[model samples]
Structure formats: C-alpha cells, structure tokens
Target chain A: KTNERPIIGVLAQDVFDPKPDRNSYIAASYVKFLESAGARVVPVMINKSEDEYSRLFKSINGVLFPGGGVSLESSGYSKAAGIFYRLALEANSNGDYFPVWGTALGFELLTLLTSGELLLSHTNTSGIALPLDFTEDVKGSRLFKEFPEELMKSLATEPLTENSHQWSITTENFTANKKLKKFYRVLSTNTDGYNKFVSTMEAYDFPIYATQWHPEKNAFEWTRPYIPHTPSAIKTTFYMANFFVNEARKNLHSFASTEEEEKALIYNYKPEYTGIQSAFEQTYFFN
Target chain B: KTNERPIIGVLAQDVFDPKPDRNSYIAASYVKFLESAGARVVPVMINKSEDEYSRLFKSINGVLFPGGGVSLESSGYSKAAGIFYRLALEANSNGDYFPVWGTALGFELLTLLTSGELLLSHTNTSGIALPLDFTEDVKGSRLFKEFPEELMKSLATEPLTENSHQWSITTENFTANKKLKKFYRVLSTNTDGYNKFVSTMEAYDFPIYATQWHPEKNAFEWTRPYIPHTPSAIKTTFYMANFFVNEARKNLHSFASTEEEEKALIYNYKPEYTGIQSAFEQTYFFN
Candidate 1:
C-alpha cells in the first residue's frame, strides 16, 4: 500500500572507467554501497543534456552526489550537481519529495554552490583514525534515531570513519551565514589531527544529507589501511549509510520512464572484459 | 523502536581478491545489492573456525547465500553454507528470528542441502530475458507484497529478468520429492526455451528464501547483454532485492565483535587496481 522501497540514483564523478580511454565512471563499490543500503542504484552519467538529466530524476527517488577530488571544480561535476539541486527543489515544491545526499567532495560541492566559493581548508581528518565530534543537540536529531546511546557515544569517541579530504567547510562560517544556517543544521563537527571542521550535516527542512568522512570506505573498500579494521568503525559506517537510505524511503516519488529512455541503461554500453580478471575467475573461468 | 533495521551477513563466494595472487574476496556488486536493500551487509568470509562462524551469527540479523557456479561447490562454500544452515536452525529453534536467502547457484545449494543432491538439470534458462510463471497463490506470498499490481503483472507476463544459469531444479522433480515438498513452497515457476523449473521458493515455516533469477544483475551489473534494459525488468530487479532485505530487517539481532574478529573485514585487505575496471569505477576512483 505504500512505497516501501525506492530506487536511488548515484551520480558518477568525472573519472576514467578503466584506462584513460574509456568513458567516465563511478566505482563499483559506490554502486554496491548504495545497493547495500537498500536502494537499486542507477549510475547517473555526468555532463548529459538537460533533457536527459530531468528524465532520469523522474525515475529515481533520490540522488547521491558522490565524493571525488579537486578536479571536480573544473569538471562536469558542478553541472550535474546543479541539475539535481534544481530538480529536487522543483519536485518538492510541486507537492512531491525527492532527496539529495552528498559525500566527501560532493559535500564540498554543496557548500561551494551555496557560498560561490570553496571555503575548504586542509584538515587533520585524513586517513583511518577519525571520529565525529557530535554536537550536543545531535541526540535530538532524527539522523541518530537508529543509533543507540552507547554506539552514538562510541562514534563520538572512537576513530570510527575514513576521512580522505584535505579541505572542509568551516563550522564557524556556516553558523555565521544566515542563509546557510537556515538551510542546514550542523549534526557533527570534528577536529582532525591539526584542524577543526564540519563532519556531518542535515538539511533544516529538505530531505538532504551529507558526510565529509566516507561511510562506504569502512565496509565496501578493501584497500588496506585507508579504512580502519576496528569493529566500532565498521558499525558506524553501517549506521551512516543506513540513515541516509531510510531518509530516502520516506519520499514516495516514482520516475516511471519511457522505453526510449531505458536504452541509456548499461545494456547498450556493452563491456569488454580486460584480461585483468578478479580472483574468482581464475578459479572458475579456467578450464 | 524494535530493531526494524538489521545487519545482514552476505556469504562471499571463494574468489581471488586482486587477481590470482590475492586473498579470498566477494564481488563488489553482491555487497551493493544487499546494502541497497536496507540491511548493512557483512561479507561472510570463508574457511574459518566453527567458533568464528558461530560468533559471526551472534551479530548479523540474517545471512544471504549469493549466486556462483561450480567453483562455489568446490571451495569453502559448502562449509560456509553448512555453518549458516546450522546456525539458522539453532537460532530459530530458540525462538529467535533469523533469515537466509539464496539466489541462482545459491538456490541450487539449498536444494542440495535439502535433498542431498544438486538435482540440477540443464535447460534453456541460461541468459538474460525470462519471466516468472507465478504460481496461482503468488499474490498471497510474502515475497511480493511490496510489488504493486502493474509490476506484478509485468513479472508474470513480461520477459523481464536476467537468468545466467544452466543448472536448475526441475519443477516436476521438486514437487515429486516428498522432502522438497515438505521443506519448500514453490511461489513462482519459470520456463526457459524448453524446460520449466522452480524460479522462486520459500521455506514452509522458516525465513529461508530463494530465487532462480538474479535480482541484482538488472542494474548493479554492467557487462553487456546479461542484464535487460527494459523498464519492467529493472523494476522487477529492484522489487526482488527490496523484498529480501526487508525480510532481513525484521530480525533485529545484532553482533558486536572484538577487535580481533573485526580485523577480518575487507578493510584489512589491500585493494589492487585491475586495469579491467567497470563503469562504476570511472564514477568513483577517478578524479
């Protein structure tokens, strides 16, 4: 009777899919991360025409603007992000709900869009050992409803997340800007080894969410040492992604698409397997 | 307030991680599909102690037996599956709720464990594009409640799925076997070009579920011609994964682990860059 499950579209960053010759792509883990969170993820291609972008939004309940590096400032990342922001506003205003979530570089994009400048600075919240400095009022926020008191406290005290960014939105500037403050509520702030910054945020009213530290890295990533091996850290990773997906489920919007538009799906792209296969293949694919 | 959101343990098929040289690993898509469905997925590592397996069960709400072929049978898959079956049976006996879902090759494993034979037969159901032959009572089945009328009809009538297996349990044999009849209720059946087989089923009383079709491939996979690009097919893929994860979320049991056990997570494995990257990677790893 209700829209209990919704499809989430994760926007791809401007990166090479395989070698430098292929099209731009999102990491397989991001797809896995979003899918693992409870939504069927559609990899949103970047730098598409306005018509293509709008058509896609109709089919997905939410958009995840994923993380990347400094190159995002000059790439199609901003153009894609701009479309999602506008479409989200248009849908919400027309008595519908559509949410946008940002992670890492995408989080920085959110601030840059609001202030017309990158207020980012190098922060100590790099590498495996980092924790969110939870605001005292976070207990009252909807974001932490699923988190038990003990685990919430653990997130506050433990090095529970992977922070790979060198730049961040200044907490004080966010609090000082009347427009920005009204749009967002600071959920958690953190002091890296050498700097203090905003680690997490929630929209004041819109169903928007963002995290500077990567929740996906804790579980989905296998790159040793980038994500810590601690138990608390892994659980916190689960909590962060779970919270965002649940927020998305509340939006009942559906983007039933035309047959023509469905062609853009991966089926048309047709991948050629590189001789570079993963471990499982050698054990199975061999004669 | 009840633990409505749960953590799911997804058993990883034994595979080389980076290449033939790396450690055992799970494919990135399986993790994504489970997490996107609403439960945080734990990669159930292979060939561990009985104590380690038992300890893992304490924290996860459910277990997912994902798809794989012959390589799965030869590796530690049987051992891992054996442990989960016992743990599930033990927990349910104690009046604790725990669920295990099988897909594709995983479905065959269920039959193998139940009847002590693979009962696998070769038929035409080998590649994308097949529809479910919904049993008359499917509307009343718990698996399809989240599916609306239009989508339900599409699943029944439209050739909307990705089927990449040559071995499947024969519907006639499954019904004839007294043990299988007693253990599972065939909720849906499907026909390839020449053979009819049980496409979906559920345990008579336990929370065990299985599907002959891949619910993950529709969107999570990017290899060409394996996953259909039709709108209806995509919807079916989303519906199936969503239903299973929701089933998992109902079991609120959690496991908090020691630092040692947590160290076994993928975060500890060093990720290798395979030049044979997929589309999603271009979206994630590149700047």
Candidate 2:
C-alpha cells in the first residue's frame, strides 16, 4: 500500500480557447503537480461517450477535478463528474479504495454533486494567497499527519496558499445544506476577497478531499506573482501536493486496458510550454 | 522517515552546440523525471568553483547524473562530475545518506571515475526495449521488492526495458577492474546490443546506483520508438523512478542557502525542451 506507484486521472474542463473541438484541456501544471508526487497522471478527456469515462476509471486509482472558469452545468462537465463520483463511491463500497481531489471549481463541483444544485454564493477572492481558518475538528483530520510541524504551523497562521475563485460555499450554508454536510465534513474556513467560505473538506470516512485554494500552482505552475515564492509557501505547496498524492497511493484500483487505450491517455501527452520556465521555478528554485 | 520531500540535484551537461561561454543546458524532461518521483529537482550548474558545488551538496539529498553523448574527457563533464563524486563520497563518509543514481552515460562516467579510465567495451544496442539479463543475485536485491510478482515476471521474460547506448561496461571488465569491483556489486547483466554489459549496479555499502538501460525514457520521454508502449514497460519505468526517489527520501539532509546563491543555481536555469514530447510520453502514452 505504501510502495505501489499509483496513477491519478485529472478530468479535463472546458476552457475559453479559440477553437471549438479543442476546448477541453487539463491544465498541464496539474499533471505536473500530480506527477511530482510519485503518481502518473492521465488527462480525463471529456468525450461524448460515457463508456470512455468508464474505460479510464479502470486504468486509474483516483480522479482529480482541476479548477476551471466554466460552470459545471453550462460546460457539460457535470456528466463526467457524476460518472466519476458514482464510480469512486461504488468502488469504495466494493472494498476498492479510490480517491478524488477537487481544486477550486472542482471544489464547487463537489458541493454541486453532493447537493441537488450549485447553491454557491457570489464570492470574489480572485488572485490572492490566504490562510485557512480551521474548523475545530481539524486536529483529528488526516490532512496534516504527514506534514512537518512547521508546515502545519504555516497553514494555520500564514496566508501562503493561493485562492482564485468567484463562487464558494460558506460554512453556514454548508451546515444548512443537508446533502452537502452529509457528504463532507468541513475542515477549515477562510474569508478572502469574497464572503466567508469553507476552505477545505474531507468526505466523512471516505477517501475524497477538496481544497478551495489551488495547490498545484505553488509546486508545478510557473505562471505567477499570483502564487508567491516564500519558503513557507513552498512548504505548504509540497505539503498539499504530497497530501493528495499520499491519499491516492493508498488506492489499489487499477486499469485493465488493451494496447490502444494506454497510448491515448497521458502516456503520449505533450505538455504545452506555458512559459520560458515554470512560474515558481525562478523564485522558489533560485531563492 | 518517509515524510521528508528530499531535493535531488541534476547536474547540467555542456551542449555540443557552438557557443564558447554558453554550453550548459538541462533537458526539461529530466526535471519531470525526478519531480515525478516525489522529489524536488534543482539544477546543479557546472560552475568553476568548488564552493558552489559544496553549496549544492548542502541543499540536495542526492544527485542524478544524467546520460549524455560528449566523451568524458573532451567535453569537460568529467571535471564537473569528479567534483560531485568527491563531494558525495565525503558527505556519505560524514554519516550522511546522500544517494546518487546514474543513468546510461552517467553509469559509464562512474566507471571512468572509479577505474581511472572507461573500461567500457564496444556496445551498441540502440532503439530497442528488452528484458533484463539479471544476475542470480537479483532476487535478493532491493531493485524489485516494491514491484508486484507480475511485473517481476515481465522484467525477467519480456522485452520491456528500454536500451539506447553505444558503450557499456562488460560484466567481465567490471569483474576485472579492481576499483569497480570494490566499489559496486553487480545486480544484473544484459547481452542484447553490445558486449554482455553489467546492466545494473548498486554501491556495495553506499547509497549509489546505476542503470545501463534508460528507465526515464520509458516513462516521460515521447519523441519516437526508443521506448515501447506496453503496460508492463510503464510499470517497470515507474518502479525504478520510485526506487531511486525512495532511497533519496531516506536522507534527512537540509540546506540553509542565501537568497543570492539559490537564485544563481536553478532559478536562473533556462531548460531546453529536448523534443516535441518527453521521450517517456511518446512510448507509453502514444503508440
């Protein structure tokens, strides 16, 4: 369980790209972030068929819903999200450990999937790093068990984590929403450029996690000034990346695909050059 | 013991392109390889100062000496490598468990450093993936313990390991060379393309390992047919990467570098994209 190299799938979200057919994309940095944590990453493409999603489910141990701008319903990401959530829950029930991680829009989708609809309040915390206002029961949570004491201190005290969102679920709203609370346990809260929102959550006795902030940005992304390069920030970034990946590593689910399928997945992916260097590389790697 | 996310330095090699002062370059995929193994990768610049190399040792828990074409003596890589070897030896001697992994040419350079000459026989097994020519002692080795029984079977019977080398150390020469024999214990052998070369080796009591075959090529590389697109090959690729990173994780070394020095090392690094896709990606992701 501690040794097998796990594979995670990051479901692609529709982007505001110039082309119509090529609108779906998994932010290359999320793949980079997951891969950096000893897990092989596969982009979960939003194909027309439900069978394709099911086919991919066999080949991966976990699913990552990356942050995106498009709404879950308007962009048609809700179908694939529903398929994966059901598959993961069913797998867990079948005694197969399958985990899922949501970042930003992904976090919102988790609430949408749990609740009957997206009851997200209009929140505007675009482009800023913030600290978590932890819930009382977080010390008993699995989030910081593997983290260093310094990193734990930083997460609770410093605003080193990045958050870029316009919509979020408030703790009060989450408490009132029975479906949402039944599905997830609130871990932390934060008030940024938006209304007070739940920052982190974990499924009650389930292997599902979500973060309101983008953890991949600090570690693998090079598109910055948005993501700071402080030592505590880098540590927080590593802690979160390792935290999610470590959860995925506990999954024993695997794919059984023919020769043609593995190639069409991440095995043949050519990551786009987003910049001259990875955004955080200059500030983090250098100083 | 497993909580530390160790930093491993990958030394930049001089490019063959015509530039007097600007000959250094690091393939971006190498960064992807080490980072994917759950370790933070930093560029170890070939600076003309011992103090710089000394500074890097304090920062990284291990070093990955990557493969290159330039002859050891002519390209001045030997001088840079020699500095790291001496520093690594001293660091390990001082009770630090700083590990090192050498791939292809890096392995050859290790022999050159140890034996005072490259005792390599003419070997050319380019552009083919083959099963290992395992030594009888391989069963007791740490190389494949994390690997499942199925993968171990494939490594023994299937042509899944990627090999693209023109020169390799023969098993005979390795046995005869006093320096090599004293320094390393051969884990396996392969007689595919070149003379029967020692395919894999681990330092007798030190945290050093070398692989004649390119494991990184099987995972992150994707330019052509150098690596195969089989599920077993990909598993083997992940296994070797995790193995090296796990060894590096055993190191508890930490660095306290100035903002000035950190900037000079990797932050200022300009990575050269080796191909349209990583060599590993081409093989496993695309057929």
Candidate 3:
C-alpha cells in the first residue's frame, strides 16, 4: 500500500512512559501537512540498535525528522532517534533508496551524526540567538542546490537568527577534526559576531542538508496576518522537500532494483525488527 | 538600541489576550531577524475605525499582519480569522506606505478580505487539501515575476496544496466578485477535484499576500532534531517574522526622500517611552 504512493516515514522522538504499552502522540498539524504532501506518513518510534533502525526503513521510502525532546547524551548514540538517524545514514551510505529530512532537533541530530559535534558545545541551546553566516566554501557544494538564492545570501551575511537552544557545533572544534572533514561540510552560520555558530550543514555528495530553521512551520496553513507566515517560504520549502523526496525516491528505487544488493539490504533490515521482537519477548517473559 | 534601527510596525490581533500574544512574541522574533538584517521591529495594536488604522500606519516603515485567532463574524465577515483581515484591507485602501505580509491564518484572512467570499460554502470543508498550482489566466501577472518558471507551470495543473483550515474560497463565488478582483488575484489553488478551495491569494498590485499553510512552523530552530521550546511551532514563526522585518526594511528604504515624505514619516515615529507606557497600561488597566 505504501508503494502505491511513496510512504514518507516521519521519525518521532520516543516518549518515555511509565506504562510499557502507552502510545506516543505526533502533533496533528504535522500529520496533516505530511499527508497533504501526497505521502503516507508512518511514525517511527525510536528503539536502540542498527538492526532495529534498518528494519523500519524497509517499510518506508523517506524519513522525516520531526521536532521533539530527546536527550542525545542520555540516549547515547543508540536511542530511537539515534537508531533512525543511523538507519537513515546507513541507507543513504549503502546506496539504498530512502531519503531523510530533519527539522529543529532533528536537524541538530543530523549535524551531530555527520560532524560528531553538538550545538554550542552545550547540551541545549533553546531560545537563544546565533550570530553567524555560511561560508563561501559550503555554498559551492551539492547541499546548496536546494537552498533559495535569497536565503543563501542571507545566511552568508546576516547574523543573529533566532536560536532557542544551548547546544551548537563548535566550528573551531568541528573544523579541527579531520575525521569530520571527510563527512560533513559547514554550510551556513548565524550572523551574530560573538561565537561563529553554524546554522546549516551537509555531507558532501550526500542527500543530507539541514538548517537551524524550520521550513514546515513556514507553510501557509499555520501562519496568519495577525499571525505571520511567509507565503514564499512555503514555496521555498515545497521546493526543498520536493527535491529531497524526489531524490530519495530515485535513490531507493535504484537500490531496490539492483541485483545482489537485496542480501545486504535484507541483512540490514533483519536486526531492527528482531530487536523489537526481542524487547517485546524480554519485557513480557521477564516481567 | 532597537529603536535606532528603522522601526517596522506589525498589526496586533484583538485576540492578543485571548490567544496567547502571537503577534508580539512573533514580532520580537521578526525584530531580531530584522535587526540582524539591519532594521528595527515594532508591533502596532489594531483599532476598529478606518481613520484609526490609517493613523496607526504612520509610525512604521512597513506593517505586517501576524497570525492569530479572530472571528470574521465579529468584523461583519463570515470568516473565522478576520480581525486583522479587515484592518489590512482598510490600511491598504487608504494608500498607506506600509508593506504587509501575512502568514497561514493571516493569509487566509487577507484572501477573505480580497475575495469577500468564504473559502467553502460550508464551514466544515475548511481544512481540506487543494492543489496550489498557478492558473493559465494569471501566468503573465507581475506577481509571477519572482516565482520560478517550473513552479508556474506546476501551478497551472496541480491540485490545491493541502492545508489545515475550515474554510476556503469557492471558484464560482470568487469569479463573481468584481470588488474582490480589484484588490486580490488568485495566485495558486489546492488541486482537489472540486476546485473551490483557494490556497494562495495576493492583493492586486498591493502589498498583501496570503497562503493557507504555516510558514512559521517550518523553521529550523523549532523543527530541528533535539531543539527544545514549548509549542515547537514557534521556531518556524521566528523565521517568518525575520522575513517580514527584512522585507519591510527594503520597502522602506526604496521610498524617495523629500520634505513632505519626511514630515509624513516623522508623524509615524513610535517613541520607546510610548511603547513602554502602552505595555504598562495594557498589563495593569486593560488586564
């Protein structure tokens, strides 16, 4: 059924419940927006392990990282968000067909995975401002293609964009890491003068692109005159999301059609589901 | 210090107290974004009379209609979000130099003002999806100048983009209103089969634009991975605010300097003291 109209898997932050069977709620607005885009939105709950992440990817064509609170430190590199993040990474890396888009915290997590850094070198940087802009070097890369020319120019010169977080990538530290240089490239920065806070980043030749700003919220449904929503912004985001999804769908379809690739893909997929079953069995039997 | 930059005034919805001060809060974000872009942000409270709205427009370089909850019925219009809607219409009608930008609900409000028709005949059909493609009739208009050619082509056949709202402008009703035609132009529509729900509308040759999606919620700060803040929708909001402030500044600077114009502008200056006084009174007496 998902194949009928490309399924877009929206990865959500897991809710910690006192009761094991309790379900988490994704915001109605998000569900509406995604469904409106002609995609079947499947909510992926974060679970630990690479296996778990891969199996979930099997059912979806693309991954959308929605905003929510999940501690990167507490969850470590293997939480539910982390698992999806890893699966997205692996799927992209292995030339599998899924594409991923990250918003707010989802954007931050993508940054962490690509660069192995955090926002502001602190855990959380919510409700603050970053005053930097994107460098010329990053603009030349593939990630820059999806960005609007006006937004790119603004990112390059304007500092002091609104940031409500304590965590940020230490550009100095990030640039210093040679390993990071291989995977991530700094794309945009806040125009603020103090710290050279990075605003957008991407992995070279990878489908990954992220900003410290949210494009979905900029849509027309949620904004008003007494309210503010930029109409051009919706157009801009539609273009960007369209670009990402189209690219992902192309990549996924190519992978699925490839011979001998199925084994590695299936192997990658087995662990995540197996882990979910194991967790279920352990909780029920042990309890 | 914020006053030192060119002040851009935004209209405040009457629902300020009832609907969590979105105009002020979002205005602050736009102010910050504008400050980053080299301008100041000001929030103007809307009053009922045409003279009052015109008088209020004097103090700022541009005016923005922030999104909020206000009933169109209260303004003698059948729509739900029509408080600032009528104000924006009155302000534009008076030859105010203020440039206005409306988001989500604000966009819908502006459409109602321009079209003088409800989006759907039944209130229940409001939030349904429509294709937002450009029509063959409007491809040559000035508004299409900034839009990409591909997008323009897509607009011709695409269904109205999906949006979350309870009302929309019907095609039959829209075609019948000459007064509505003078003020606004249908730029895009939701491509749903009925073809009644309009998604995007712009005031003809005037500085008003509206859409049925939320551009504010799509910001990176709100939707990025782990970023924390209440009502995660706020991040996209900040981005929209910034865009408005920046646009206002550009429009303000475009005016030719002349003695009469300068005198007119001076009358519009909003002193910091007055703002403080207004805040104080609103908090104490009005509350």
Off by over 4 Å in 2: A1-29, A33-64, A68-104, A110-116, A119-287, B1-3, B20-22, B258-272, B276-287
Error of 2 at A160 (Å): 20
**TM-score of decoy 1:** 0.56
Native-vs-model 2 lDDT? 0.71
Q: Judge candidate 1 against the unseen true structure and give its global Cα lDDT, from 0 to 1.
A: 0.67
TM-score of chain A of each: 0.85, 0.89, 0.67
> lDDT per residue, candidate 2, A1-287, as tens digits?
34245778888766555366465766666877765555667777664577777777876778898887776776756678889998988888888788889899889888888787878887768778788788886888877666666667778888777888878888889889888878788888898544688989999867889998887776455455666444456556556766777777677656665344455456454444334453333221000
Residue B7 CA displacement from its true place in model 2, Å: 1.0
TM-score of each: 0.56, 0.61, 0.48
Better of 1 and 2 by DockQ: 2
Candidate number 1, chain A TM-score: 0.85
- All candidates' lDDT scores? 0.67, 0.71, 0.46
Per-residue lDDT, model 3, residue B244, is: 51
Residue A217 of model 2 has an lDDT of 73
lDDT for each residue of candidate 1 in A1-287, tens digit (9 for 90 to 100)? 22445567777666433344344555454555555444555667766899988988876778888776536566777788888888897888787877788888878888776666657776655564576788876867767877656778888787777777777777876776777787878889887545567888878777778888777765445434445434455456655656666766767765565344344333223222211232110010000
Per-residue lDDT tens digits for candidate 3, residues B1-287, read 02222455554445344433322223222222333222334444443455544444554566555444556545322222244345545555775434566655566556556656655443343333233455654565544455445544444444323244555566666667777666677766554456555555666666665666543322211112222122112222334344455445444332234333333321122212112222110110110
lDDT, model 2, position A7: 76
